[PDB]
Amino acid sequence: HMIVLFVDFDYFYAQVEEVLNPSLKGKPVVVCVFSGRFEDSGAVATANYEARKFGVKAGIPIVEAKKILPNAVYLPMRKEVYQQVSSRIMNLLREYSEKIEIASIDEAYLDISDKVRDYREAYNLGLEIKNKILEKEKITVTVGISKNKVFAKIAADMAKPNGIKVIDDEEVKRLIRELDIADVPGIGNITAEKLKKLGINKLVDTLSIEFDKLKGMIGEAKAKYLISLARDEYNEPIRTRVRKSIGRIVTMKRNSRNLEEIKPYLFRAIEESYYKLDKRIPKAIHVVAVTEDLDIVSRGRTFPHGISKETAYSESVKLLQKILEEDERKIRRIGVRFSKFI
Template sequence: MIVALADLDYFFAQVEEIMNPSLKGKPLAVCVFSGRTKDSGAIATSNYEARKLGIKSGMPIIMAKKIAPDTIFLPMRKDLYKQVSSRVMKILENFSDRIEVASIDEAYLDITKKVKSYSDIMELGKKIKEEVKMREGLTITVGIAPNKVFAKIMADMSKPDGLGILRDNDVNNFINSLDIGKVPGIGKVLEDRLREIGINYLGDVLKVDFLTIKNKIGKAKANYLLSLANNSYDEPVRPRISKHKGRYVTLSKNTRNIEIILPFLKKAIDEAYNKIDGLPKSIAVVTIMNDLDIISREKSFPYGIDREKALQESLLLLKKILEDDNRQVRRVGVRLGKIYKSSTLDKYF
């Protein structure tokens, strides 16, 4: 399998620069205003000029304004970004018959059948970048590797406007030299736990007893790391079809206190259930952390679940998120999936 991750550089801010070329070269930050106060909210993304001044994604707006008051702070324009994203995804579809849209600014492409050699891979990566730049004016970073996780890491290492390719014969060295904290899905809490048992690099996973790792970070994460370390990870690129309903709410303040989060979680569940006709067979709790990173946990059921059951299960999923991550929660939400419409007597009369 050969996978490419196409990741648009500082997407929201870059779109604003294209819409208003006079912004180019000036420090610029796109903000998510929470509405609590005039300057409450966080930085969604910033261009590289603003980053040089110390502005980072997830930083409170009020703090960013103190650090770099001459920065241009713009509100997020979701509809505009969605339109641009949709056009970019259409471009990417020309390079693969299997594309998985991972977020508004990144997508995985299965290019296994499109390339036969390293030169083919290099050429395809360049064409993706050239096509997006020519048609939308956007720079995009492309990471290419034998699996989705390694492709994402290669993209992260190649930003901005880069092309990173992990060759098959370089995989072992890559695994042995990859800092465990750089592995997607390994937050600070899990990173610290792994370092406690001598795992500082991905390759170290193969040097530690699996049971020790499982007891430290849980079976699912242990299996995930093992599959990466022995290069057997093979999650396919899955085209996603949206079949879920979701609802998200902003907390009154950033917190890790479950008692404070619970009423907001219940509100999200109630509003999500009000939007569906039937019962969901899967539920996911989604948290947007204080730095705007998104973490989710999901559970499926053999039957549709009602609101009360959804709240019980959501609370357990929320606790799991907080156990695995030590950051504060800014927003919380739920996604209801596999919605099952029960038959009623009305259809027979």
């Protein structure tokens, strides 16, 4: 069958910051996203393991991080930089297999089925790849290897950080019955709970439930997905993913429902969005708002043609107005998203 090798870069953003300023190694490093509402308002994008040991991780408020680690190194997120480093590493991987799926800024899958035979050679190829990336970009990564993408990923999670692991056909059979359903990619907290209310704590448990009831609880796609995995039949092909949308969203100094007060933020979002679009022309635009109670509302429109900067501006305000008149809540974050590229 198919042999998949998954690469996931270790504590990536923070590690890139270490590569660019080596003295940082050994010290707790936290990459922050400062919202500008107040001094250290915002959240953590990621932290290195020195910092994670004490509970400082992605998603917690920067303020909470500083209470725990007042003397750690706090850096503003520099996405562009991390993206360029990522691209280079992806190019190196692209040399080990043409069948590659760049799943995100820091992970990719390679179909090495006709590149090696048996897991042994696969394992050796993983070490070659780890060594090559460490040598070329001084970045440590974790390799996951199995028969399909979901398990290759799971193997990497199990080997984090700077590890490599193979989950052979026998171990998969074991995991299908031993693994906590919540540790399965695609199963967030909302799905974990529904599956719990169904008596489904492991993958195998999805086989002892009437499909119709499963489908009714979590949806058909997710249901067929889990059953497929449980039947040891999951086998999605590794394929090139293409960017389908580009957008920007900013946090406003203060929460507001005032149009003239919100426009500047919206227009700044549009400007960045367009620059990032580069030479892409979208036919669809969506105005996205995050309300005072962290809920997310959006309004959009598809055009029978490409959207120009002027159009985007004009339309953005109409969609923003539609949002204000339709949701009595104050707006905290405002932005845009362009999709359906020509």
